[PDB]
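Help wanted!
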Amino acid sequence: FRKMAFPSGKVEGCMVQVTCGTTTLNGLWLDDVVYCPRHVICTSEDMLNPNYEDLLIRKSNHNFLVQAGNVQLRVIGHSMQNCVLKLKVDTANPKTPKYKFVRIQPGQTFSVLACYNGSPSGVYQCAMRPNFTIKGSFLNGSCGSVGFNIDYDCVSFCYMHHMELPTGVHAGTDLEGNFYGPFVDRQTAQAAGTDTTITVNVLAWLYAAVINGDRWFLNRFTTTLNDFNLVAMKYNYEPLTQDHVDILGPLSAQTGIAVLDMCASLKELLQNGMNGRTILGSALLEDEFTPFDVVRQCSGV
Amino acid sequence: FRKMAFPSGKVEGCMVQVTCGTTTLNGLWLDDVVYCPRHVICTSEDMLNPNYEDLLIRKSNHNFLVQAGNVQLRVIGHSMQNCVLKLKVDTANPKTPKYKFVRIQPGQTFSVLACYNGSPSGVYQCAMRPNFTIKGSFLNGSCGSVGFNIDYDCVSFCYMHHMELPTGVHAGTDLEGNFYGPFVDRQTAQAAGTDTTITVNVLAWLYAAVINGDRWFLNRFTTTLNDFNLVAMKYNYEPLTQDHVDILGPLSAQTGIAVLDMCASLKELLQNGMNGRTILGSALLEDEFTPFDVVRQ
Ligand SMILES: CC(C)(C)c1ccc(N(C(=O)c2c[nH]cn2)[C@@H](C(=O)NC2CCCCC2)c2cccnc2)cc1
Ligand SMILES: CC(C)(C)c1ccc(N(C(=O)c2c[nH]cn2)[C@@H](C(=O)NC2CCCCC2)c2cccnc2)cc1
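Answered by r_m:
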């Protein structure tokens, strides 16, 4: 059981470089529009309190150099949608996949294609934390990299990278420029809130463990939703809802362990630790696999 | 710090489905050649003692059904090279990337594009274990999925997947069909040898933790190389060679921590564990990042 990213080819063909004056980052080229963070028009001076509407009124089309690999794309228009800049270019991307823009919920996972200077560098599986940050691997100039899911030939873009927070976690927007989390695209003292662990994902991962070899953490007992959430609160775990329990239905049936059965196992794990054991490859309880991830991975979708 | 894989697009455009008899698996379509495990020609009771030369001589071109997405590829010739079958096809792959075939050594990392029925399922980063196995995520029909690196748009193919071993780990070949390790493409009693931790990689990852702002595991000691190895082998760590020490030189110089000083830290880490702490987000000592991977990330 590995953390698996989606194959990234459909997205690699959309990655371009966008330079505005002195700053370079990545953009997403879909049909004849390039999408990138609006903070690309910010200068090392504007950083503290940019007036983005004013900075954009200043700009003309020629202020943006867009390069797809080695071909320069002519910019014929520019506009802002919330925190994303939209550069109209004269050529539709002939590699544009079937795609949707979607906004995901905390606890949902996606693949990230990390890019630098418009060139794909690596791909990894990530999760939207409950505090709306991404524990990504992003260096300087990674802005404009996107997160995505694929559903049988359709790429659902859910994340565009904007900034790093002082704890080294990351903040970005959906592809309509709406931020995930209470963060702003300027130089400020903002910090991620206290994060919590994605309980339904830990349960899914325990089901994935049982599906493979590891069964040592199971017991004969059951808990209640109320009793378990009292422990969840103590350990800064997200509360578990009847909806979570239903989502875990398929895995409960496959394995013969009911959700509150598994909650009893996890509750024991939270207090007594793992007593030297591991569960899959990990001494930690993993929470970046969704119920759907576990079934897709254990079924070869 | 993520275990990140190479972008998979250049490899995606090469994956095809190969069918022989009732058996389907994946092939790698480069130029006018499809590469796949030769055990696609094995029958359900050939599995214990197949004679592949005899099995192959009885096949003609049209016994191989090659499908690239929706289009059937016409097989015009076939030959066997060690444990890989090479099917010559009608058409050169237009999506063929710049590529090379490389054989890697234990401890090296690579990306795997897991595929089923010729279609890519997922991508993940992997390491070749000292016992020549791969701790992969592979299900039935994964055979012929490949492992690779990419460097300056050139794809280095280093692994083709062949089989599952009893412990749940995986064995395969280079793209010339030579197995990694003492395994054979045949149903037997074979089992992976005792595995060990890739010591040079753990040290690389400790250097990565220091390049990020984490110094908590360092100490004021040093060690000789022989004393380090005598201790580390008691935890099933691979011996650290002078080659390994030279290879870490760049990370040592970037961080100002002598290689044998980092070895002293590791020795103490093995003795104490983590005491409820984390290094680069992990509660275990991570060994599937190489000195090269740390510099890149
Ligand atoms: C304009 C604005 C909003 C202040 C800004 C400035 C720099 C960047 N960062 C670029 O790397 C970058 C930006 N444009 C080209 N490159 C880095 C970044 O977030 N530093 C933050 C630290 C101080 C507080 C705000 C910025 C970065 C991003 C991702 C991974 N590691 C480092 C992101 C946003
Ligand atoms: C003919 C030969 C060499 C014995 C063979 C037989 C089956 C396969 N397995 C295919 O799934 C498969 C075969 N052809 C299409 N799919 C599986 C496999 O390895 N071992 C089984 C047979 C060998 C002995 C133990 C288990 C497999 C499962 C999961 C991930 N990886 C591979 C591989 C090789």
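OP: Thanks! One thing I noticed: The pocket of X77 (ligand 1) is lined by residues A 23, 25, 39, 42, 47, 138-143, 163-164, 185-187 (CB under 6 Å).
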